[PDB]
């Protein structure tokens, strides 16, 4: 899922997990005890919270995530580093 939704619902868990609405707490606490993810779940509304995870490749040879995040970030911090230079133009003097 294309993040920025990490604290979320439970019906997609009870739908894709082929589990019920009730048995998601066993699910999340046992999955934390396994050791593939380490985020302490917001349990009051069955709201997920996640950490480090193991990947299975992105867009078909990692086109889209790589471009629109990696190179977007490249030109982000690169060009705003040029802006750091632009305001720090002669503070080296």
Partner 1 sequence: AVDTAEQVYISSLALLKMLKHGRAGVPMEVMGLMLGEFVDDYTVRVIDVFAMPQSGTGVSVEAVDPVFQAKMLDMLKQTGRPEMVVGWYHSHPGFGCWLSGVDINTQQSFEALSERAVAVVVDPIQSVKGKVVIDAFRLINANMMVLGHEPRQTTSNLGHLNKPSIQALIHGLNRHYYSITINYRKNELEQKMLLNLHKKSWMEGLTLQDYVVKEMLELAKNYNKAVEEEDKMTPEQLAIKNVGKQDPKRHLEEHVDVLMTSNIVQCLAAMLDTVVFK
Partner 2 sequence: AVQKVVVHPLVLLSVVDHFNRIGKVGNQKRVVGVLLGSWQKKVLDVSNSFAVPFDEDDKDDSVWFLDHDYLENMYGMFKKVNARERIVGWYHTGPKLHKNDIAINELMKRYCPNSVLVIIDVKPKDLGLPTEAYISVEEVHDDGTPTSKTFEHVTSEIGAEEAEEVGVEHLLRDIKDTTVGTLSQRITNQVHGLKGLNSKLLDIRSYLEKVATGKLPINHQIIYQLQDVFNLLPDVSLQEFVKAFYLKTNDQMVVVYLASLIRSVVALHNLINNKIANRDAEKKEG
Among 21, 51, 27, which Cα is nearest to 38's? 51
For residues 11 and 81, which CB has a smaller minimum distance to partner 1 in the complex? 81
Residue 29 engages partner 1 in binding (rule: CB under 8 A): no
Query: Phi/psi of residue 47, each to 5°?
Result: -100, 125
Which of the choices partner 1, partner 2, none does residue 4 contact, using the CB cut-off of 5 to 8 A by kind? Answer: partner 2
- Shortest CB 67 distance to partner 2, Å: 7
Identify which of 40, 45, 48, 38 has the alpha carbon closest to the alpha carbon of residue 1: 48
**Which residues bind to partner 1, rule: CB under 8 A?**
76-77, 80-81, 84
């Amino acid at each position: 899922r294309p993040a920025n939704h990490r604290q979320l619902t439970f019906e997609e868990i009870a739908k894709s997990a082929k589990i019920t609405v009730n048995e998601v707490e066993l699910l999340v606490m046992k999955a934390l005890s396994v050791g593939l993810v380490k985020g302490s779940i917001d349990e009051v509304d069955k709201r997920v919270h996640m950490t480090w995870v193991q990947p299975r490749v992105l867009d078909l040879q990692q086109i889209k995530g790589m471009k629109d995040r990696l190179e977007f970030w490249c030109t982000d911090v690169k060009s705003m580093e040029m802006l750091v230079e632009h305001q720090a133009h002669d503070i080296l003097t």
